[PDB]
C-alpha cells in the first residue's frame, strides 16, 4: 500500500554547470581559421512556457572562455610568423616635411638604418616612414619603442583580422538557456526564458571605449553597473539604436618590401601619395546629443530626477584606455574622444570630426610578453560601423546625490564579451530522476 | 546615496571590560583600528568576518544597516582609534581611553 519510489528517465532537470563551449560558424580569417565546424541554419528556439530562470551577469564563465579562446587564436595565428628582431638597429631620422598638413607636423619620421641583407655576410641601407608613436629617442636617433620589451614580430599579413560571428554550442546533454526580457537587469530571474542548443554568432570585434556592432537593446537604452554603489565597477551602457560612425585614413598609403633573411619578407611604409592628413572619424552631432539624452534619463533611474549629470575628458592613464581604439580596415586606430564628453546635464554642421592616431606596434591585451608589427595597408582606409554602447566609469566621493560624472573607461575585453553573453547561461540536463508510485515491482 | 553614522564618541572603559562600539550604514561595512603614527588595519569586514590574524577578542554582528563591534576582555594594547567604512567613505575616528 505504501508508496514506492520509482525510476523515471529523460525528465527535465537543470543544473547550473560549465563545460567547454563548442565553436561553430556560418559556412583565412584569424577568428574562425575556417576550423570551426559549419552549422545548420536551424536556430530552433524553444519557448519554455511557465518557467523562470536566474541569470547572473558577470558570473557566467562563458565570458572567460571566450576571453581566452580568442587569445589562443591570436597566438596561433602568429606562431607561423617571422621575427622582426633585426629591426633593433638604431635609426637616423628626420621629421617628414613633404606636403605636411600643419596639424600633422612631426607625426611621421623618415628614417634609415644599416640592417642586413638576407646574405649572412652582407648589409644594406634601408629606410621607411614611421609613426612617431612607434619610436623613442635612442638618447636625449631613434630605436623602436619596444626594443627594451619583448621582441616584435610580424608576418602573414594575408590573414584577415576582420571580425566574423562566432557561435557556441552546448555539448550534447547540455543546453543554453536564454532571457528574452527587454527589461532584464544584469542579474536575477527572468520570466521570458526559452532555450537553444547553440547561439547566434557574436563578433570578436573589440573597442577600448565604445561598444561596436553589438546587438541593440530591445526596448530602451540600458545600464548594467553591477552593484552601482561600488564605483570601481565598469558601467555597461547599451544603446537601443545604432550610431553611425565613419572613419578614414586619408593618406594614400604605399608599401615597400624587404628581405631580412631567406624567405623573410618585411613590410615597410612607402612614401604617401599626396598631402598628409590626419586620420579621422565622423559621427552625427545631433544624434550624439539625442542619444546622450536617452542615457541620462537612464542614469536618473538611480538618482533623484533633478540631479546633475556630467561627462568629462578622460582622466588619462595608459593610451590604450585613454583613447578609443579599433582595428577597423585591418589597421589600428586611436582617437581623441574627449570632445564627445564635453557636456553637462541639468533638470529640464550636423556632425563631428574626431582627430585620430595610428600606431603600428601593437601590444595586445594586457600582456607584456609579446608585441607585433602591424603591416602597412596600401590606399585610403575607409570604415563604417554602428556604435552600440558605452563603457563608462563614475567618480568616487560624490555627495548629496548630485553632480555625478562619468568618463569612458574599462577596456578589459571581458566586458565586451559580456555585452552579448549576459543573455545566456549554460545548464546541465539531468534526465535521471525518481518519483513515488502506487506500483510495486512485478514478480519474477 | 551611502550614508553612515556612529555612536562611540570616546570611551573611558577599564581594562578587561568587554566593550562595544556601533555604527550603521548603507551598504557593506568594514571596521578598522589605528594608532597614532601608524597606518589603519582591518579588523572585521563585510559586517561579519574577522581579518586573518585579528585577535580572538574581536567580534561583531549585523542587522541590515545595523552594525556592532566588540572586544572581549579589553587589553591595554587595544587602546586605539577605530573606524567604520563603506567604500571611499569613512566615519571620523573614535577611541578608547582610561
Amino acid at each position, epitope marked *: 500500500e505504501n508508496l514506492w519510489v520509482t525510476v523515471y528517465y529523460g525528465v527535465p532537470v537543470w543544473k547550473d554547470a560549465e563545460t567547454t563551449l563548442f565553436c561553430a560558424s556560418d559556412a583565412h580569417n584569424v577568428w574562425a581559421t575556417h576550423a570551426c565546424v559549419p552549422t545548420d541554419p536551424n536556430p530552433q528556439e524553444i519557448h519554455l512556457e511557465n518557467v523562470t530562470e536566474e541569470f547572473n551577469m558577470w558570473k557566467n564563465n562563458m565570458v572567460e572562455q571566450m576571453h581566452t579562446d580568442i587569445i589562443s587564436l591570436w597566438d596561433q595565428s602568429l606562431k607561423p610568423c617571422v621575427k622582426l628582431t633585426p629591426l633593433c638597429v638604431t635609426l637616423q631620422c628626420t621629421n617628414v616635411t613633404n606636403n605636411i598638413t600643419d596639424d600633422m607636423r612631426g607625426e611621421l619620421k623618415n628614417c634609415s638604418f644599416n640592417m642586413t641583407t638576407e646574405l649572412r655576410d652582407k648589409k644594406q641601407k634601408v629606410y621607411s616612414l614611421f609613426y612617431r608613436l612607434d619610436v623613442v629617442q635612442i638618447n636625449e636617433e631613434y630605436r623602436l619603442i619596444n626594443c627594451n620589451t619583448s621582441a616584435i614580430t610580424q608576418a602573414c599579413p594575408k590573414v584577415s583580422f576582420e571580425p566574423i560571428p562566432i557561435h557556441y554550442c552546448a555539448p550534447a546533454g547540455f543546453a543554453i538557456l536564454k532571457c528574452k526580457d527587454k527589461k532584464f537587469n544584469g542579474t536575477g530571474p527572468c520570466p521570458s526564458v526559452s532555450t537553444v542548443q547553440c547561439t547566434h554568432g557574436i563578433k570578436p570585434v573589440v573597442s577600448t571605449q565604445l561598444l561596436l556592432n553589438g546587438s541593440l537593446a530591445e526596448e530602451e537604452v540600458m545600464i548594467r553597473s553591477e552593484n552601482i554603489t561600488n564605483n570601481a565597477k565598469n558601467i555597461l551602457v547599451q544603446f537601443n539604436t545604432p550610431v553611425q560612425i565613419n572613419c578614414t585614413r586619408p593618406n594614400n598609403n604605399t608599401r615597400k618590401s624587404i628581405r631580412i633573411g631567406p624567405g623573410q619578407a618585411f613590410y615597410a611604409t612607402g612614401d604617401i601619395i599626396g598631402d598628409i592628413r590626419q586620420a579621422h572619424c565622423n559621427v552625427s552631432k545631433a544624434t550624439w546629443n539625442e542619444t546622450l539624452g536617452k542615457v541620462v534619463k537612464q542614469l536618473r533611474k538611480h538618482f533623484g530626477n533633478n540631479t546633475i549629470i556630467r561627462f568629462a575628458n578622460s*582622466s588619462g592613464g595608459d593610451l590604450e584606455v585613454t583613447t578609443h581604439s579599433f582595428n577597423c580596415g585591418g589597421e589600428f586606430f586611436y582617437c581623441n574622444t574627449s570632445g564627445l564628453f564635453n557636456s553637462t546635464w541639468i533638470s529640464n554642421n550636423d556632425s563631428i570630426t574626431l582627430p585620430c592616431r595610428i600606431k603600428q606596434i601593437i601590444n595586445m591585451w594586457q600582456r607584456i610578453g609579446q608585441a607585433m608589427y602591424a603591416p602597412p595597408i596600401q590606399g585610403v582606409i575607409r570604415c563604417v560601423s554602428n556604435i552600440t554602447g558605452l563603457i563608462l566609469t563614475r567618480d568616487g566621493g560624490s555627495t548629496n546625490s548630485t553632480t555625478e560624472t562619468f568618463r569612458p573607461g574599462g577596456g578589459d575585453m571581458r566586458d565586451n564579451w559580456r555585452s552579448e553573453l549576459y543573455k545566456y547561461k549554460v545548464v546541465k540536463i539531468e534526465p535521471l530522476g525518481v518519483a513515488p508510485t502506487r506500483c510495486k515491482r512485478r514478480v519474477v | 546615496d551611502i550614508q553612515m553614522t556612529q555612536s562611540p564618541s570616546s570611551l573611558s572603559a577599564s581594562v578587561g571590560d568587554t566593550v562595544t562600539i556601533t555604527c550603521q550604514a548603507n551598504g*557593506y561595512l568594514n571596521w578598522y583600528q589605528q594608532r597614532r603614527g601608524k597606518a589603519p588595519k582591518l579588523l572585521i569586514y563585510d559586517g561579519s568576518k574577522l581579518e586573518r590574524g585579528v585577535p580572538s577578542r574581536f567580534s561583531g554582528r549585523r542587522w541590515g544597516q545595523e552594525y556592532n563591534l566588540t572586544i572581549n576582555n579589553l587589553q591595554p594594547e587595544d587602546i586605539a582609534t577605530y*573606524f567604520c567604512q563603506v567604500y571611499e567613505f569613512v566615519v571620523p575616528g573614535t577611541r578608547l581611553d582610561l
Partner: nanobody
Amino acid sequence: QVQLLQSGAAVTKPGASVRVSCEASGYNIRDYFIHWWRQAPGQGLQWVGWINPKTGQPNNPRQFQGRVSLTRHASWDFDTYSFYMDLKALRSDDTAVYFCARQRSDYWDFDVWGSGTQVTV
C-alpha cells in the same frame, strides 16, 4: 612580503608641485586596485583616489579634479610595480599624512597599507 614600499616625508613652500610614491612587493599587482588616502593630523581619513594598475587608470573625487594625478610603473622584468601621486600645487590644507593601500576585495577591504608619509607645506 606583500607590504608596499613607502616613500619618505617631504616639505615644500606653497604652490609647489610634489610627488610621493610606493612600490608593490609580494603579490601580483594586476589583480588589485591601488588606493590613496590622506588625513589631516587630528582628523579622520579622506579618500584620495584609485588606480587600476593594469591600465594606469585613475579615479578621483570632484574635489581634486585637475589638481592630482596618479601614475603607475613597472620593472622592465615586471617583478616590481610602482605608484606615484602628484600634486600640481600646494596649500596649507594639503598637509596630510599620505598613504597607499590595496583593495583586497570588492568591499574595499584594505588589508595592506603603506606606513604613509608626511607631506607638509
